[PDB]
Design a protein around this ligand. Structure first.
Ligand SMILES: Nc1ncnc2c1ncn2[C@@H]1O[C@H](COP(=O)(O)OP(=O)(O)OP(=O)(O)O)[C@@H](O)[C@H]1O
Ligand SMILES: Nc1ncnc2c1ncn2[C@@H]1O[C@H](COP(=O)(O)OP(=O)(O)OP(=O)(O)O)[C@@H](O)[C@H]1O
Ligand SMILES: Nc1ncnc2c1ncn2[C@@H]1O[C@H](COP(=O)(O)OP(=O)(O)O)[C@@H](O)[C@H]1O
Ligand SMILES: [Mg+2]
Ligand SMILES: [Mg+2]
Ligand SMILES: [Mg+2]
Lengths: 468, 334, 491, 46, 469
């Protein structure tokens, strides 16, 4: 009553079964590669029923060395991963195999990685600021406790550095559990994160699930689901606050699109799978805080070729409560974190939640920066003197504000040698209220570059001669 | 220094061109030498004996694909039931059954609508209401059993009925005790068809009427003084029930099916010239040992091999051709 | 005139060698062929990616496996394939010979020599698709790989085990950077210490043959071929070799990396690998994606570049540093392959034609170039002198654009102009790490503020020469202790 | 000078190769005979 | 019989069925007959693919109009071959090797198959030796390599063919070796003009002409380059001659390959090109090369579709060249001839180690000035030079004079303008552009630098315009 391999084309494998023994959709099947140099056990996830007792499956491991006709065994259940407090402090792969301690967690309770999202009647909007000590984030994109946070950005703009910074600034003193899903990213970064968490002593409270970019598309599709299953167990069963870090969530979509045509699906616009939005919706709707059970999730969303209109990030946008959007233009200026204050957003950025003063200051900053963006071209072509005195004042104010929104982050020390700094929310609001009022117009704009609070500003201006 | 390095490089290159020229001439004249040497028949016999030896020392190993699961199971059930049932029928009954089944198969080919609507108990009732008396009782029983199961593709139904007709013809041949005669005749016919690819291609055009090609084969190859009647009829109905497959392919398939019913397997052995009867017995013995089951051996004469054996079965070949060794050695000289 | 031993004794050795044992094996038959692809019926036991032996010594690789047939890519000499030919299993997936004999040799993606210098003694064989090191088999990148280029070594430092992408338009100095990086390892090679030696593999994909010869000559002149291997898949090679050569080079490098050695592998360039793989996939009729590329092109590059890694001490501590090259088109980095590779590697060095024409050579675009290892891939002295050089230059470029002034702004513009002049460097003129440290020290500490901009370069040069003529203890101290002591700073 | 050296070396090595080709024809017969013997798995007089 | 029959005909692509065991090898030449009166001919088909079931897909070298399914096809047992030898010099041939000017000529010559592998890698020797042309822009900024590969990129009507004729005039006339001209997918009247001009200049006797032009099936257009290359290869290898291989236009070879691939049923690549675009380019180009001690100086005109240098064809062509002269529509519009884009053209031998320090320094200064000028074009287009600083104004004037001076009255341009061409020695070019960069001609009018030779012509034209040098 076991099937056999019929067709092999990269990560997609067709398997024939006896009538009445066709595995259910998403069941995990086991095949064997007996070639010595690559001997292994292939896990195949049933993707489609092709009729005539054939099923199309997506391999989790590489199919090199697989032979047509080899026996395929149906496990009778979907891919399941270990759950419980025991997964904290260890590294797993998409299938739940422990990496640092092979064989560990084999006897834990196992949960299917395929799960329906919480019922709508259980949902409750989350409106509660999550202070981070980052001036730009706290002022213009206030994060939400138990909300959904994304860091959009192109390749190499600082998404990972900002994830690590938020792990430092949030997960260090976090009272609950942390789950980090490395999805289709660099193995070196995974090792670095593992070592850094061990050094910070945060590993004992964190479960790491890694499926890197060298893995086949199936692993990159399902690693996010595995990590989300662990986080869901912590949320629902243990009744504990959870921190869910995902880097990079776009790799889930990309892996899905890599196999879309091999599964026989007509491609959609921009080469994506037709089921882009639906698969994204299932995954993202699983990542949520239900009434009384909190998940504070922070995802890094890769924006291909810096094109924010690309279907992937464009579809992802709908699933977030706060979005910090990193810009290539800001990055190339040396402003760090390379946040685009004119494009980022937060649902709790309104007078009701953050208070009148915070909202007024943030709106004034945004107005000034928008005006500066409007005048950029005129300044470049006709120079500055052709602007009105009011616009010259605004341009100076805007340049100083733009520099001050930069900050020396802890996780960025390795790249600058300058130890990071933290700025309380009240200090940020007061400092930017002073900036928008032209209080610090006498200081050079360079004094505002990569500093923390107002004391740092005074110190750096003094090092430059100017007096605050 | 650059000049000296270039001089060394060109010196080495010239040395290598001389080396490869010597290799080419040496291999060519060694090939000529061996071709001259092998002309002695006793040399051929000794080479065959050596390869047979190698076959004995070489240790054995434990180890209809086009059909799918549903079609395969249906065909297996139908053939088993046919063997159980029709075995007791008389030779004349077998001939009548085979003719009726061939007529049924050609009819089903003529109208594909019925096959389409039938591949997916009422099937039987339809069969009696259609051709209850047009076919004998045994023919109707076999046809109703055939429609009893389901088929992955409608073409599998016509394939199954053709298989049943071939089985009936082979059964009548066996009852007469001339299974070996029909097997040898089929193998020779396939050989000659392969020898003349133009004739096989001409016969392979299903567009032309079946009767014309059947008459061609009868008055060209099938109908001759030294042709078995059963083989003649089997090949005639096969060509008449053709669906674009090459005639040689159909003939070899028929021979394979016949030997399979005999319980053995086919083994096509090629050699420079025919081998002694003792050599034949030894080869059959070693093949049966290596594959663990009795295997019929069919001899092909082709001097290009210049000795040895080129046994082939189940898509795997054990080669002893002297020409193959010569080519391998030629490619073995860098 | 001739030793008469090899020429005559080779045949005798060969005849003593042709055992030619009888073999029982599955044979398939070629059913159709053309354009470098061939379909083979039979071979029920063939593996995915298995190597197939066609008649005449032609090799193929089984890529598509279905019930009907097997779609295979021919690895050269595809014009000798005919319908009906017999195809033989090899029983192995793609693999190449590996060993120390490959140093100083030019080979094709199968490991066979093409320099015409005789057979290579292979230590062993290595499959091309062995898994990359895991998360727990690595360690942090912490050893600097000195390219000898001030801009790269001070602003986008490369550590051992890192993947740094050299991306730019054609004729922007990408191969110049990579070849200079290879040549800069001569000093480390001569020390004889395997912990400092870097063995180099240069993969040429789709390059004109004479350009590969030019690279080989440039390496021979600088003594680089003593520790360099070249894997060549020139533009005339079959698309199979173009698709396969980076994997062959990676396997050759991996053999050394897993044996405690440090390897630098250059791919010149992955755009042509992607083109060849797209050609193969289209000929095999696999559905296409963006720019007609197969859905798994990102996988093609990612699994290749993830084998460049820094191994943990338990695995010997070896490393393989990757230097993939990408040729952008009209300076657009938004294209499919450039975006994929940029998202794969550990930073990038963007070479721009506009910067190159202005005299900024190497034409590193400071603002968008970055290293993702950072100070960890630098010695202490370089970190201190060049702590914030990249961001300083980004600010300088932004302010230069704005200014089309205040005293502070003028000072910033002057300092930035001096630093930009400082980072200029001719070709084939590497700088030792200590010389780089001293030059960057001059630039950043302000000692060039009293020099005219157009003089900076000359000044720098002369001053370094001065330190070599006398006061050489500064270079010695930097080189030995890896840090500039405050006493050495005062001196 | 390097061009002249290359030219004279070309002539000298061409003469060397011609002489080697002339000389080597004596022993090739033994090579081919031994190859025939081996591929026939038995000693061959010729 | 061992003959085949036509089963399918789709444009210039024909499927032929052969008896089993008689299937021709890939690239074999087959012959079929068209019998209809007006179009009666003997089709030459080239085996391109094996389709299975003894079917072969073949490319026709002549229009298949009038061909009938079922006609007999004979296998010649060998690929297309062309005559070789010194006898081909002075004559005009088509892709199949038939002589056009003297039909039946060369049938008794040695014939070489047009398909062969490129030279072994160990036989390749990089070539770094400047081929001086007398053109200021080419000599200064993109020096050509003797025994190297030169390309002239350009859109439609920017002067590719005129520049090819200029280089024939400058290099081929005073050439002791053999020249091979390959007209590929270009105007037939251009071929007739070249033939007449070569006869007039007494260069034909040393030249072999091979023409497959626009009004040809794609098979001929994609095999004529191979035919001409085979003639050049025979001259290089079998005779030890210096060879000049002129090709116009290689993009036509690529485009014909694309049409053939569409006919063959291959899945299109980006921009509709054949999947095997880079590979066909590579095989053809790597057959064009100078081996060790055997020199081919090849010059190829590359068409750029819709002025799109990003198009896959020229983009893949770029990698096979030693020197690249990229003609620009922008430069052409200004009346500057040759319409070279100095900032886009390049040469592998423009480095101080090969051309000396003076040549390199002057060229780099010219390129820097022109780049700075191009960077200012945004401001200048809106406001003019008046808003630029004094340094930028001076650089802009210098750059405008430099860009005028890079133009030259070409020898082949006399037929258009009526003015004789000029040759400029390399040393004079270097010195003149050195003075231009320094600013020793900043006072002369811009028009004084337009379409002249060396400094003597500059002085004379300045005097005519009322200035003094
Ligand atoms: N630092 C440098 N200083 C001066 N010239 C340089 C420098 N780097 C490269 N060049 C020159 O620039 C030209 C282009 O360099 P190179 O061939 O390395 O570039 P590339 O991007 O690899 O080009 P391609 O696309 O042709 O392969 C060559 O003449 C090279 O000598
Ligand atoms: N040096 C020149 N002096 C004057 N006119 C010129 C010069 N070069 C080109 N032209 C003009 O430009 C026209 C185009 O020249 P040419 O045919 O050589 O261009 P091309 O790029 O090969 O064109 P096409 O794409 O049509 O083949 C010439 O007919 C002539 O009118
Ligand atoms: N806050 C920062 N300060 C200084 N450099 C930074 C900062 N953030 C990012 N960078 C630089 O940008 C690079 C890309 O950041 P990273 O987040 O690792 O990549 P990505 O954004 O693509 O995930 C880093 O390697 C680092 O060199
Ligand atoms: Mg990242
Ligand atoms: Mg290069
Ligand atoms: Mg033209």
């Amino acid at each position: 009553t076991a099937g056999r391999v019929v067709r092999i084309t990269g990560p997609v494998v067709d398997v024939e079964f006896p009538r009445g023994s066709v595995p259910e959709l998403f069941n995990a099947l086991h095949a064997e590669i007996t070639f010595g140099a690559l001997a292994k056990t292939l896990t195949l996830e049933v993707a489609q029923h092709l009729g005539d007792s054939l099923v199309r499956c997506i391999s989790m491991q590489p199919t090199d060395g697989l032979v047509r006709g080899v026996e395929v065994t149906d496990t009778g259940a979907s891919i399941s991963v270990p759950v419980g407090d025991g997964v904290k402090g260890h590294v797993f792969n998409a299938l739940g195999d422990c990496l640092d301690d092979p064989g560990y967690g084999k006897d834990f309770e196992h949960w299917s990685i395929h799960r329906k999202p919480p019922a709508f009647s259980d949902l409750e909007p989350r409106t509660e600021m999550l202070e981070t000590g980052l001036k730009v984030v706290d002022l213009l994109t206030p994060y939400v406790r138990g909300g959904k946070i994304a860091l959009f950005g192109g390749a190499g703009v600082g998404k990972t550095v900002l994830i690590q910074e938020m792990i430092n600034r949030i997960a260090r003193n976090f009272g609950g559990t942390s789950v980090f899903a490395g999805v289709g990213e660099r193995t070196r970064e995974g090792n670095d994160l593992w070592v850094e968490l061990a050094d910070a002593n945060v590993l004992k409270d964190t479960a790491l699930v890694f499926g890197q970019m060298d893995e086949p598309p199936g692993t990159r599709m399902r690693v996010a689901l595995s990590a989300l299953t662990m986080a869901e167990f912590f949320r629902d069963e243990q009744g504990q606050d959870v921190l869910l870090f995902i880097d990079n969530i776009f790799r889930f979509t990309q892996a899905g699109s890599e196999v879309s045509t091999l599964l026989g699906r007509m491609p959609s616009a921009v080469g994506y799978q037709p089921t882009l939005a639906d698969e994204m919706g299932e995954l993202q709707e699983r990542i949520t805080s239900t009434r009384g059970r909190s998940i504070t999730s922070m995802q890094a969303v890769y924006v291909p070729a810096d094109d924010y209109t690309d279907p992937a990030p464009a579809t992802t946008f709908a699933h977030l409560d706060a979005t910090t959007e990193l810009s290539r233009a800001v990055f190339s200026k040396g402003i760090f974190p390379a946040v685009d204050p004119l494009a980022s957003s937060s649902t709790i950025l309104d007078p009701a939640i953050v208070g009148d003063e915070h909202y007024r200051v943030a709106q004034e900053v945004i107005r000034i920066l928008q005006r500066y963006k409007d005048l950029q071209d005129i300044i470049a072509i006709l120079g500055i003197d052709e602007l009105s005195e009011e616009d010259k004042q605004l341009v100076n104010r805007a340049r100083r504000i733009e520099r001050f929104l930069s900050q020396n982050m802890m996780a960025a020390e390795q790249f600058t040698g300058q130890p990071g700094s933290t700025v309380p929310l009240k200090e940020t609001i007061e400092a930017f209220d002073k900036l928008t009022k032209g209080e610090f117009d006498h200081l050079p704009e360079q004094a505002f570059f990569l500093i923390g609070g107002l004391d740092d500003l005074a110190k750096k201006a003094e090092s430059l001669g100017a007096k605050l | 220094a650059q000049g000296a390095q270039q001089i060394q490089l060109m010196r080495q290159q010239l040395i290598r061109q001389l080396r490869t020229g010597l290799g080419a001439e040496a291999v060519n004249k060694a090939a000529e030498i061996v071709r001259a040497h092998v002309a002695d028949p006793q040399a051929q016999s000794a080479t065959v004996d050596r390869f047979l030896s190698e076959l004995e020392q070489m240790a054995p190993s434990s180890v209809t694909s086009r059909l799918r699961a549903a079609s395969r199971q249906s065909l297996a059930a139908l053939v088993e039931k046919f063997d159980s049932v029709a075995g007791g029928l008389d030779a004349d009954g077998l001939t009548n059954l085979a003719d009726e089944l061939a007529s049924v198969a050609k009819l089903l080919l003529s109208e594909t609508a019925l096959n389409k609507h039938l591949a997916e108990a009422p099937k039987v009732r339809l069969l009696e209401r259609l051709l209850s008396d047009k076919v004998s009782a045994t023919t109707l029983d076999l046809l109703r059993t055939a429609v009893s199961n389901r088929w992955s593709t409608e073409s599998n139904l016509i394939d199954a009925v053709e298989h049943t007709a071939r089985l009936a013809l082979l059964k009548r041949a066996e009852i007469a005790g001339e299974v070996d005669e029909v097997e040898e005749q089929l193998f020779r016919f396939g050989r000659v068809l392969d020898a003349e690819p133009r004739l096989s291609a001409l016969l392979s055009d299903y567009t032309t009427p079946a009767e014309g090609r059947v008459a061609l084969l009868d008055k060209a190859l099938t109908g001759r003084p030294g042709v078995n009647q059963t083989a003649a009829a089997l090949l005639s109905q096969t060509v008449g029930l053709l669906r674009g497959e090459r005639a040689d392919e159909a003939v070899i398939d028929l021979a394979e099916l016949a030997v399979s019913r005999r319980g053995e397997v086919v083994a096509h052995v090629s050699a420079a010239a025919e081998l002694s009867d003792a050599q034949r017995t030894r080869l059959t013995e070693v093949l049966s040992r290596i594959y663990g089951r009795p295997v019929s051996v069919q001899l092909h004469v082709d001097p290009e091999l210049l000795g040895g054996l080129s046994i082939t079965v189940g898509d795997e070949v054990i080669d002893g051709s002297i020409a193959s060794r010569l080519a391998a050695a030629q490619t073995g000289l860098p | 005139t001739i030793s008469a031993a090899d020429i005559e004794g080779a045949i005798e050795d060969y005849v003593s060698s042709f055992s030619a044992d009888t073999e029982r094996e599955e044979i398939g038959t070629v059913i159709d062929a053309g354009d470098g692809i061939a379909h083979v019926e039979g071979l029920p036991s063939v593996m995915t990616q298995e190597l197939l032996e066609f008649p005449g010594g032609v090799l193929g690789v089984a890529l598509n496996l279905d019930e009907h047939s097997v779609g295979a890519v021919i690895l050269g000499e595809f014009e000798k394939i005919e319908e009906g030919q017999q195809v033989k299993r090899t029983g192995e997936v793609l693999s190449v010979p590996v060993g120390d004999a490959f140093l100083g040799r030019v080979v094709n993606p199968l490991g066979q020599p093409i320099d015409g210098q005789g057979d290579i003694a292979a230590e062993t064989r290595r499959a091309l698709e062995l898994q990359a090191p895991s998360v727990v088999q690595r360690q942090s990148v912490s050893e600097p790989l000195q390219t000898g280029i001030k801009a790269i070594d001070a602003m986008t430092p490369i550590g051992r085990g890192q993947r740094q992408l050299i991306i730019g338009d054609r004729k922007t100095g990408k191969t110049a950077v990579c070849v200079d990086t290879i040549l800069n390892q001569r000093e480390a090679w001569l020390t004889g210490d395997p912990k400092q030696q870097v063995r180099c593999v240069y993969v040429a994909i789709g390059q004109k043959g004479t350009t590969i010869a030019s690279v080989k000559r440039a390496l021979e002149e600088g003594g680089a071929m003593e520790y360099t291997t070249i894997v060549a898949a020139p533009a005339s090679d079959a698309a199979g070799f173009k698709w396969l050569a980076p994997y062959t080079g990676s396997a050759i490098g991996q053999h050394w990396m897993y044996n405690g050695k440090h390897v630098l592998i250059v791919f010149d360039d992955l755009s042509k690998q992607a083109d060849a793989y797209r050609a193969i996939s289209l000929l095999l009729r696999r559905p296409p994606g963006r720019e007609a590329f197969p859905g798994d092109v990102f996988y093609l590059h990612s699994r290749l570049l993830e084998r460049c890694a820094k191994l943990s001490d338990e695995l010997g501590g070896g490393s393989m540093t990757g230097l993939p090259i990408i040729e952008t088109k009209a300076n657009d980095i938004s294209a499919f392959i450039p975006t994929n590779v940029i998202s794969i590697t550990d930073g990038q060095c963007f070479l721009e034609s506009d910067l190159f024409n202005q005299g900024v050579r190497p034409a590193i675009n400071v603002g968008v170039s970055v290293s993702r290892v950072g100070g960890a891939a630098q010695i202490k002295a370089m970190k201190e002198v060049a702590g914030s050089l990249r961001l300083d230059l980004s600010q300088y470029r932004e302010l230069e654009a704005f200014a089309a002034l205040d005293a502070a702004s003028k000072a910033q513009l002057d300092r930035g102009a001096r630093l930009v002049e400082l980072l200029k460097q001719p070709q084939y003129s590497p700088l030792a790490v200590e010389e780089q440290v001293v030059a960057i020290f001059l630039g950043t500490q302000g000692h060039l503020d009293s020099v005219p901009v157009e003089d900076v370069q000359r000044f720098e040069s002369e001053l370094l020469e001065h330190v070599k003529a006398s006061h050489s203890d500064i270079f010695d101290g930097i080189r030995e202790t890896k840090k500039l002591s405050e006493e050495a700073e005062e001196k | 000078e390097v061009a002249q050296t290359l030219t004279q070396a070309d002539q000298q090595l061409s003469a060397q190769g011609d002489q080697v080709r002339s000389g080597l024809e004596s022993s090739v017969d033994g090579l081919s005979a031994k190859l025939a013997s081996r591929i026939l798995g038995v000693d061959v007089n010729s």
